[PDB]
Design goal:
The structure is cut from a larger assembly and holds seven protein chains of seven kinds. By secondary structure, chain B is of the alpha+beta class. Helix content of chain B is about 20%, strand content about 30%. In chain B, strands 1, 2, 3, 4 and 5 form a five-stranded antiparallel sheet that branches. Chain D is mainly α. Chain D is built from four helices and two strands. Chain E is mainly alpha-helical. Chain E is about 40% helix and about 5% strand. The chains are: A alpha+beta, B alpha+beta, C alpha+beta, D mainly alpha, E mainly alpha, F alpha+beta, G mainly alpha. Chains B and F meet through strand 4 of B and helix 1 of F. The complex binds magnesium ion (10 copies) and zinc ion (ZN). One magnesium ion (MG) binds next to loops of chain E. The structure holds one RNA strand. Chain C: One of its GO terms (cellular component) is nucleolus. Chain C: This is Small ribosomal subunit protein uS9. Chain C: Belongs to the universal ribosomal protein uS9 family.
Chain lengths: ~190, ~100, ~140, ~140, ~180, ~55, ~60
Amino acid sequence: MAVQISKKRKFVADGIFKAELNEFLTRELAEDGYSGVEVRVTPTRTEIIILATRTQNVLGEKGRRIRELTAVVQKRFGFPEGSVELYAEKVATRGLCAIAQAESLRYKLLGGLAVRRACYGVLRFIMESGAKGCEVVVSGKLRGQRAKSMKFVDGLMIHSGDPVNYYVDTAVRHVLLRQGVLGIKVK
Amino acid sequence: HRIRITLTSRNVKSLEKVCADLIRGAKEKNLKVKGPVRMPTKTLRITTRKTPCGEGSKTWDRFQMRIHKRLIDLHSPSEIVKQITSISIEPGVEVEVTIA
Amino acid sequence: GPLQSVQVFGRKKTATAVAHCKRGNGLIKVNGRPLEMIEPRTLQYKLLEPVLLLGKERFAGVDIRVRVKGGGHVAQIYAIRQSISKALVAYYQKYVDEASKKEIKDILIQYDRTLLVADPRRCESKKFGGPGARARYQKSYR
Amino acid sequence: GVTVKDVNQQEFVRALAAFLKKSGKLKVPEWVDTVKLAKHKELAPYDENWFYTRAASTARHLYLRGGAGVGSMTKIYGGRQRNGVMPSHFSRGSKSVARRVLQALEGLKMVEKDQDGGRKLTPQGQRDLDRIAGQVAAAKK
Amino acid sequence: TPDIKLFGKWSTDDVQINDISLQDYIAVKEKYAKYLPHSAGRYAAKRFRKAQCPIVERLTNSMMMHGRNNGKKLMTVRIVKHAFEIIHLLTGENPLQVLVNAIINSGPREDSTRIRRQAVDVSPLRRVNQAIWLLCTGAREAAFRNIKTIAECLADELINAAKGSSNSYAIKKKDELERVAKSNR
Amino acid sequence: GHQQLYWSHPRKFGQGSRSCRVCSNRHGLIRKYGLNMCRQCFRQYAKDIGFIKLD
Amino acid sequence: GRVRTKTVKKAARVIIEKYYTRLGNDFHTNKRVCEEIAIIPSKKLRNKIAGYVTHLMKRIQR
RNA sequence: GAUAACGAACGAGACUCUGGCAUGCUAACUAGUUACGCGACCCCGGUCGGCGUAACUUCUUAGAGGGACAAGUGGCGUUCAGCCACCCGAGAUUGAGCAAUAACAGGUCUGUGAUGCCCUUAGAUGUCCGGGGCUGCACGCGCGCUACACUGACUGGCUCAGCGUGUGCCUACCCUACGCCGGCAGGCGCGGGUAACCCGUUGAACCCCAUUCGUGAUGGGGAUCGGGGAUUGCAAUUAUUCCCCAUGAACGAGGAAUUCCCAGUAAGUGCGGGUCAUAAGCUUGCGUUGAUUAAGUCCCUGCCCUUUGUACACACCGCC
Ligand SMILES: [Mg+2]
Ligand SMILES: [Mg+2]
Ligand SMILES: [Mg+2]
Ligand SMILES: [Mg+2]
Ligand SMILES: [Mg+2]
Ligand SMILES: [Mg+2]
Ligand SMILES: [Mg+2]
Ligand SMILES: [Mg+2]
Ligand SMILES: [Mg+2]
Ligand SMILES: [Mg+2]
Ligand SMILES: [Zn+2]
């Protein structure tokens, strides 16, 4: 291509391609079991895969709410006509995905269930899935005006060292209420 | 018959697995090839503050990004290479191809 | 048809002094020019301790050509003394007996170990929040 | 075997100066007396013929390395400015005092700019530039 | 030439150590001699590896002080080198005997400290490090704001210490160091 | 006319022109390597972009 | 201070208890053997383990 | 190792990165050395980074593998954990990153289209266009710069670096060789480069060798405040930056008090980036010149365990 762009700008312009594609698909597919993307560039195709759970409810009316995203993303990054395709595949071993469990918490909380209930409703699910340890941490104002940070931990959990990169998982989600704001950290 | 195929990427081992794949299938199909020539890696440097505000002892983060680059020259025709630059390509890797 | 090319390197800080040894006359030149018009003229005998410790008969039959890269003004002297010392021992190694090498090695070592052992020392980085590698900034109270 | 490289290159210009004085076809410019040679020096040259020395220094940088010395003559003859605030950067030389010199050394025949820029020298001038070196060599012990 | 060692046209032998106390902790002889007074260093990583550095090198390393001299050893060798020429042509002796005499005549034997103070004696290595720091500072103050090179200061200070003519901050601070610890010993 | 006065300053150049591409604030822009994003959001999206604290 | 940790002390013994006949006295021999009698991920932990093993086969022969 | 305790967990350590060892391996017309033939010259040579290519990887480059572990030898110790000394060897403490339970009313609503309540909302606390201020000055403190000179300022000459960045989304703003016009700031034409391919082999600084030089603020020192030329821009007045007008002022080695620091370290010393149309007395990194002292203690200011005492538990900034 004659735009004759360097290499450093290229590895950045595609790091930003992945980052805008995740912030935009997160801020919209949150309640529908969203878990991230993984892009694949070919000789003139691009197969973006939504790593969701409810794949039937993320197509809408027979691929409607996906064929809308097909012409949105083209009109955004300026792609050619039909160089993108969207597969919406389910995530296996659903117990170990953090934003996948945090959305089920920020809608179990919104539906008015109490906190000590739903913390055990996540924690029993992710001890059932076959993991080792968890550190579900909730903060924000609770049945008062002074704040207080709760926590629920069992199992085994490491904090320091390099192996935090490729063992553990980390998730943060704000959740809103009419009275205030609660926050969730998962480890 | 002067074709240079550049392999540039971040992931060292998967880039090594593609440059040795793309050499072992050339060697197992009988065409003379040069070596897996390794160019020096480039780095990036970003040093910011680890603070939204200005409060705290003055402490700074840092960020890097390494990048590698390899190039391979051949002596072959220019049609079977579309197949050759397709056998077990790996994600992340940015392959350039020049026939001129 | 002799091809007795003995290529020896040597390092100080960033001083990649490469000596070289052929067979012929006994003469030494560095970057072409001889040993006189080399740098600091206060440092003259540091090219003669390879001569004066051993003698000037030891350098009979070996001619020398020296490449130099990198470094400051002093390290390009401590890399071109160690280089031609390691090239003398490596010429008596490969082309003549291994036994008369041991006296020459012993005499050079019984004077200074730097002749044969490089210096495993370099400069050191600068941590954040200091004007150097160890020194921190001026801390003031009240 | 004698050349420039065995002569302790400090008084090679203290006799090449006197040779380009004695022959004296160098086209000294009009404005010789009233220049600073830099933007960092503070005084004029102490020596009354400061032009022949710089023609001999240039004629040996040119003997030694390169056919591409034009602004690399100012990159080799700068120095240290003194701003009264912090040590100043290696400041450039002067463009005119060397453009006028190389056009003044083109008046006789020792330099010839051909390609890839810059001024290179000729073997005919290399004869002269090489014979007085063996002279100084034998006359100095 | 078996092993003659000019220090820039001097000789290593004909050196005679008078005291028995400073016998091995002062190395200015056969094995411990080098054509020049310069080395690559690495003489402080161990504790008593400093007592093998020649006293010529330790004078060179302790001559440069006060800011505008940190990093000039190749320069401060030259002062010593003219200093032994001047001493050779003003006294007419071996100046490495003169210097070993000046170290002896300049080293202290006791010092006062805090337990109102009380006095003890000194170590020989303490006495070397003190006599060197003393007479080098006394040469520098006498060459500060004075038309005299530091070589001619060190020459006369080494002379009036191997002479004891009370023209020496080196001997002069020895009585104040002894008489204080004498009243209170 | 106000359609000739409404934007009648040069906002061609200078850092009073640009802004963040995430927050649209005008303070602290890492203009290097074409990022043009605020350093807060750069620290937030550094992991997914690819910068990492090795040393 | 070079003090061997309990993760070392616990693995020197089960290796002795199971391969007492195969082990020896030289350091570089059992240094190659623990690689193929045990899943040790690195090299430094290898040389530390065999370095304390050859200190026990000396204390045992005493 | 002793034992009414036994077995497990995180934290430390382990780990990843960088730093010096490999003549053995992996390879190179986008990096290099050794050979032959051009040349030019000095009577065999010296040459390049001006030329040409034959063999090769020691140097340059980055990948895999080894390599060092208190292993050996003595000394010391319940003959346990270990410490000191020594040989052999490139190394017998390299340097940072990540980091615990519990908690503070530490700071940030002036980073956010993360946000609850309160005020204002068309005569606007929303938004745009012209100005001017955030830079004012009897005093006081904190961070830094040039200095107080002969180990020294001034003219020549001489010869050596390592990390980097660099033609843009809206975006108009790149590093620049090489030819000329001028004191100089620069200009006018010309070419390369999306980068080990050009800028560049990045002829970087004191230090190096020959030159003039005070006991008085001297050629040391070069500041508040005075005449003229060019560049960025729609615009420089309160002077945006640099050369060419000067006052050539205080300062003769610093009081009580106090910070930092143990080996390529303190200090000296220049470069790169960041901020950036204009731009370094700040900061973040790199190199080069390279030391003196120490291998120890609880006196000072503080921390860590065991025992003790208590009228304190918003906890000695206590209570009374
Ligand atoms: Mg000044
Ligand atoms: Mg310079
Ligand atoms: Mg002095
Ligand atoms: Mg643990
Ligand atoms: Mg832990
Ligand atoms: Mg709070
Ligand atoms: Mg608010
Ligand atoms: Mg103050
Ligand atoms: Mg004054
Ligand atoms: Mg103190
Ligand atoms: Zn924000």
